[PDB]
Design an enzyme around this catalytic site. Structure first.
Site, mmCIF file in Angstrom:
data_model
loop_
_atom_site.group_PDB
_atom_site.id
_atom_site.type_symbol
_atom_site.label_atom_id
_atom_site.label_comp_id
_atom_site.label_asym_id
_atom_site.label_seq_id
_atom_site.Cartn_x
_atom_site.Cartn_y
_atom_site.Cartn_z
ATOM 1 N N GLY A 1 -105.849 114.916 39.320
ATOM 2 C CA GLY A 1 -104.466 114.707 39.712
ATOM 3 C C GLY A 1 -104.370 114.310 41.173
ATOM 4 O O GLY A 1 -104.538 113.134 41.510
ATOM 5 N N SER A 2 -104.099 115.291 42.033
ATOM 6 C CA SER A 2 -103.981 115.090 43.482
ATOM 7 C C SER A 2 -102.936 114.067 43.938
ATOM 8 O O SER A 2 -102.340 114.222 45.004
ATOM 9 C CB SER A 2 -105.347 114.720 44.067
ATOM 10 O OG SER A 2 -106.288 115.754 43.839
ATOM 11 N N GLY A 3 -102.719 113.020 43.149
ATOM 12 C CA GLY A 3 -101.731 112.019 43.511
ATOM 13 C C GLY A 3 -102.107 111.067 44.637
ATOM 14 O O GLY A 3 -101.236 110.634 45.402
ATOM 15 N N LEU A 4 -103.396 110.734 44.733
ATOM 16 C CA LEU A 4 -103.893 109.821 45.762
ATOM 17 C C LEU A 4 -104.559 108.584 45.155
ATOM 18 O O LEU A 4 -105.304 107.881 45.840
ATOM 19 C CB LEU A 4 -104.890 110.540 46.678
ATOM 20 C CG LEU A 4 -104.369 111.749 47.465
ATOM 21 C CD1 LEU A 4 -105.505 112.390 48.258
ATOM 22 C CD2 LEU A 4 -103.251 111.305 48.388
ATOM 23 N N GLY A 5 -104.286 108.329 43.872
ATOM 24 C CA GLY A 5 -104.845 107.176 43.175
ATOM 25 C C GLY A 5 -106.276 107.367 42.703
ATOM 26 O O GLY A 5 -106.987 106.398 42.398
ATOM 27 N N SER B 1 -107.931 108.056 40.007
ATOM 28 C CA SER B 1 -108.351 107.262 38.860
ATOM 29 C C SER B 1 -108.527 105.769 39.176
ATOM 30 O O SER B 1 -109.562 105.176 38.850
ATOM 31 C CB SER B 1 -107.343 107.448 37.717
ATOM 32 O OG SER B 1 -107.848 106.937 36.496
ATOM 33 N N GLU C 1 -107.634 99.848 33.225
ATOM 34 C CA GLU C 1 -107.022 101.173 33.244
ATOM 35 C C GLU C 1 -105.672 101.284 32.547
ATOM 36 O O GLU C 1 -105.401 102.265 31.845
ATOM 37 C CB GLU C 1 -106.873 101.634 34.694
ATOM 38 C CG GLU C 1 -106.312 103.028 34.869
ATOM 39 C CD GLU C 1 -106.433 103.507 36.307
ATOM 40 O OE1 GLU C 1 -107.493 103.241 36.914
ATOM 41 O OE2 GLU C 1 -105.488 104.149 36.823
ATOM 42 N N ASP D 1 -102.078 101.506 43.558
ATOM 43 C CA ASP D 1 -103.348 102.217 43.694
ATOM 44 C C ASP D 1 -104.595 101.349 43.535
ATOM 45 O O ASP D 1 -105.552 101.474 44.314
ATOM 46 C CB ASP D 1 -103.413 103.363 42.691
ATOM 47 C CG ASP D 1 -102.291 104.347 42.876
ATOM 48 O OD1 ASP D 1 -101.271 103.949 43.484
ATOM 49 O OD2 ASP D 1 -102.415 105.502 42.408
#
Lengths: 306, 306
Positions: free
Chosen positions: A108-112, A114, A146, A158
């Site tokens: 997760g983290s939300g920093l792209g 993936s 993706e 991202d």
């Protein structure tokens, strides 16, 4: 063997305007910046008609038969996802190699995370097989792999940040075209901004989304002039607007302003001489401060000749 | 003592949209880039009570009694203008110093010689007197000294290019606001563009200007992708339009496109493998081809301790 690494990113403004179908109909604008938290990958060509996967980020350490494609068991999807597309797009015979992968920030983290990993794996393959793919093609290929092949939903900012790197002003035009305006950032502004920042880990929409899109513009102008104060103002006005609740106990002991990002993560803008005060207060809570620095380079690969 | 230097620039596109009132009414757009041709200046303080000027560019070499202001004789105006403006703006006591000046390009040229030199001189003074003037302030102050204080007419792109450096996309907004988008240019695009270019010296308007302004947008987007061919087209399409006569012996020698800049100065875009031919033919003319390289830095100063 070949190695590669890609940076994660921080959304500074415009977040969302890049996501379909808003971008498709109105056009999006985003200002983001890559940071020193990376996704890494190394590829070594083996000659044992096999394909070994040690994906720490995908809790997977299996071995498979060197096929033309690798089914998506749901294990190491990103690596399998990249490999499959590569074999198809270039019609190459199956390949034998050992690939290792790991990230600096959880799923997760939300920093792209993936998108950064996918770009990172692509870069390795590009280096490993000399693929005629540059920044734009890589980002495109990454998104396609993706957002389609793997059916993962998200925006487009991202993939591009990870591929291009640094401070970027992106325009997501209708007919899914994308213009990346690579901004050079004076060193003092970069330093001033980091000393002013704390990373803390814990219809009518449209009308709002238009304001957000417009913020990408005001934020660009504000940071280019090194006006962190205006940046702070823009973040506040936005926070206020994205509310009219979960853990705003963080904003309780805060600074000047804040912005919430995906995966439970607040980007605070504080007075440099008080930054330390903020970090200690936040550290008393249940979450933690994430130390970082902006990084100017985008994804890249290199070879180690044995 | 202190030294400084500032680069000249090539007007890639939008040339003219920066001039008032057009910039103020419709708004301007400019894409330009500094090159390795400079303006140099060295200033050394002295306790002689005199002010010695040795300006190879203004073709002046005179000594004057140290004053608070210097009469604009018509000699070393640029130096006098800067010196006066700085004495006033900072309310400083008379200064005693030796100042040397020279440029790599003549009066007319069409590379912004004058503005580049004013910036350079300003930079020497800023370095010299630790003045609180950054990029934006320096450009604006330079435009004001040259355009108002000295009455000289012209646009705004020149002052900003000299102080900022590199490939810039400038927005000269209505109500004279200015935004400089410093663009990071991939090295291969710069090298590709450099091997594709030759520098050779020797009412319906507005509708025409709206196109020149537009070209800045098309040119930015073309060069960010390395599409030199598209850049050639835009320059060519702009050429035919700049015709609806003089020494066009130059354009006579085929290439992909050409563009003239304010006075004896043609910019040619040619296929790299054919550049040497173009260069050889033109040099066989009555003029000469000026070799250059793009430079990413703007004006700067340094101190030499002894």
């Amino acid at each position: 063997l070949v190695r590669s690494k890609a940076p994660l990113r921080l959304g500074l403004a415009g977040g969302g305007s890049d996501v379909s179908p808003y971008s498709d109909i109105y056009g999006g604008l985003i200002l983001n910046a890559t940071i020193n938290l990376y996704a890494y990958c190394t590829i070594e060509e083996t000659n044992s008609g096999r394909i070994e996967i040690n994906a720490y980020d995908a809790q997977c350490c299996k071995s498979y038969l060197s096929m033309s494609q690798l089914e998506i068991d749901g294990e190491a999807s990103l690596i399998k996802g990249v490999y499959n597309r590569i074999i198809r797009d270039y019609r190459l015979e199956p390949k034998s190699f050992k690939i290792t992968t790991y990230n600096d920030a959880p799923a997760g983290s939300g920093l792209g995370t993936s998108s950064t990993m996918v770009v990172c794996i692509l870069k390795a393959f590009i280096e490993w097989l000399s693929l005629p793919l540059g920044d734009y093609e890589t980002s495109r290929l990454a998104y396609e792999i993706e957002r389609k092949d793997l059916g993962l939903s998200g925006g487009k900012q991202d993939q591009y940040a990870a591929a291009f790197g640094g401070f970027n002003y992106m325009e997501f035009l209708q007919n899914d075209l994308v213009i990346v305006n690579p901004l050079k950032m004076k060193r003092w502004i970069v330093d001033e901004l980091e000393s002013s920042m704390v990373l803390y880990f814990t219809q009518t929409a449209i009308e709002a989304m238009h304001k957000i899109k417009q913020s990408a513009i005001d934020t660009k102008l504000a940071l280019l002039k090194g006006d962190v104060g205006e940046f702070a103002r823009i973040l506040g006005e936005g926070w206020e607007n994205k509310k009219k609740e979960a853990f705003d106990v963080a904003t309780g002991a805060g600074a000047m302003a804040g912005k919430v990002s995906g995966a439970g993560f607040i980007m605070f803008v504080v007075e440099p001489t008080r930054k330390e005060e903020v970090v200690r207060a936040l550290n008393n809570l249940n979450g933690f401060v994430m130390p970082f620095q902006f990084i100017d380079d985008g994804a890249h690969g290199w070879k180690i000749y044995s």
